[PDB]
Amino acid sequence: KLTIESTPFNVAEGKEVLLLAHNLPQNRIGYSWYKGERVDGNSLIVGYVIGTQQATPGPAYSGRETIYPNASLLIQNVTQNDTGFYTLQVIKSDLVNEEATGQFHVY
Numbered sequence: 001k002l003t004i005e006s007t008p009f010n011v012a013e014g015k016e017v018l019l020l021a022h023n024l025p026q027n028r029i030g031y032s033w034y035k036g037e038r039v040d041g042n043s044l045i046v047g048y049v050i051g052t053q054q055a056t057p058g059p060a061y062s063g064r065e066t067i068y069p070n071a072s073l074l075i076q077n078v079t080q081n082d083t084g085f086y087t088l089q090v091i092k093s094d095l096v097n098e099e100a101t102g103q104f105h106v107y
């Protein structure tokens with residue numbers, strides 16, 4: 001099963017956290033990262049198409065997020081408001097998509 005690991009879980013203010021994705025499905029074609037506990041287009045941080053490597057941001061995009069081809073999400077220069085949940089959806093070529101959440105704490 002798809003799972004999210006935040007590293008580090010505890011992040012000092014001003015530093016960076018990397019959200020790792022374990023057990024990606026093989027016939028995947030893209031990723032979407034959301035702020036919060038659910039897939040919700042209004043909290044889309046960033047969408048990513050594997051085939052073309054095109055990263056489409058926003059509305060939850062600040063300046064600070066980077067999505068990698070292996071689906072990990074780097075958030076830099078973290079603030080006190082970033083404390084919370086983050087949800088990844090992996091879109092598959094057959095659209096039987098998978099999701100996971102997703103947590104870290106800023107001190």
Ligand SMILES: [Zn+2]
Pocket residue numbers: 105106107
């Ligand atoms: Zn605290």
